[PDB]
């Protein structure tokens, strides 16, 4: 069968802990007064929720509430733990009330409001310098949540609030968060396509934080190289061989080889062979001044088919890309 794989950071963390802290199943929801928030806006509808623009008439605060849905229920306590566990972090959204809405009589979480810019408009206006800041904040919020024994699952842009004018930037949707554990085996049905690592698209069940230093990879090619997406599959077959006309096939043989992972034989008339680029390939008049050698570097250092060897998000913290931030 496969080889078994464990994290090389934070790999016992949960382990130590009292069982209520990872135990989500057996968490007591303390519920707020609904009362208390009226709805402004619907701001969208998610897989699993309505999310709206909200007013605490209390405070008069501006609130996003997030009116759960779902059908896979264990999910509603297990992001109200996570949530819970991470409050207070760095650049983790926060969680600021739970109450029961009484019209879909499920439970709505109520966050604290970040005023957002569309990244597809925003990310178009980052300079170099904005890129490094604001994948520095990004890394600040993974390794604190990393350090928690929790991964997040899906790092995209959607999923990353800025409010530009105070560069103020929060990780949000923690819905298919997971506790990690050595040894588990998890859904590789998570995260979305274009941000999926390689072990979600050859079915490699016992991964770990490291899949979120890839998603964040993929989403600094975007900006860095201005594609978007930057790997741009059709559907999650494709996906991978999207990944393999960049990575090359070989190392993706030497990756599933040496987890003793068998590809899907669909792959057999779709892969092809390719070979590894150099990043060089995708550097172009129009986004050279987002590149650099530190750039290029760091994103070689997470595009990794190999979970075991992508920088952590502290070994990333250390990286020169980040060395003309202002800390």
Known sequence: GPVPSRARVYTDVN??????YW?????????????????????????????????????????????????????????????????????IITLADIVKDPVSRTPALVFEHVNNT??????????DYDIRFYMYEILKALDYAHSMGIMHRDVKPHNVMIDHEHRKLRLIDWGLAEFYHPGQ??????????????????????????????????????????????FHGHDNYDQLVRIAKVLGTEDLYDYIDKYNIELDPRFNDILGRHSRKRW????????????????????????????????????????????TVVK
């Open 185 to 230: 085996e998890y859904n590789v049905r998570v995260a979305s396509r274009y941000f999926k690592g390689p072990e979600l698209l050859v079915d490699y069940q016992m991964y770990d934080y490291s899949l979120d230093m890839w998603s964040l990879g993929a989403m600094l090619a975007s900006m860095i190289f201005r594609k978007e997406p930057f």
């Open 23 to 91: 135990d989500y199943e057996s968490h007591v929801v303390e519920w707020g007064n609904q009362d208390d928030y009226q709805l402004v806006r619907k701001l969208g509808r998610g897989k699993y929720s309505e999310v709206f623009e909200a007013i605490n008439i209390t405070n008069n605060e501006k609130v996003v509430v997030k009116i759960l849905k779902p059908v896979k229920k264990k999910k509603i306590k297990r992001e109200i733990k996570i949530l819970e566990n991470l409050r207070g972090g760095p650049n």
């Open 280 to 323: 060089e390939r995708f550097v172009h008049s129009e986004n050279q001044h987002l590149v650099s050698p530190e750039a290029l570097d760091f994103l070689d250092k997470l595009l990794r088919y190999d979970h075991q060897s992508r920088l952590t998000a502290r070994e990333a913290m250390e990286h020169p890309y980040f060395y």
């Open 118 to 127: 569309d990244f597809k408009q925003l990310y178009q206006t980052l300079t």
């Open 15 to 20: 382990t130590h802990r009292p069982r209520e």
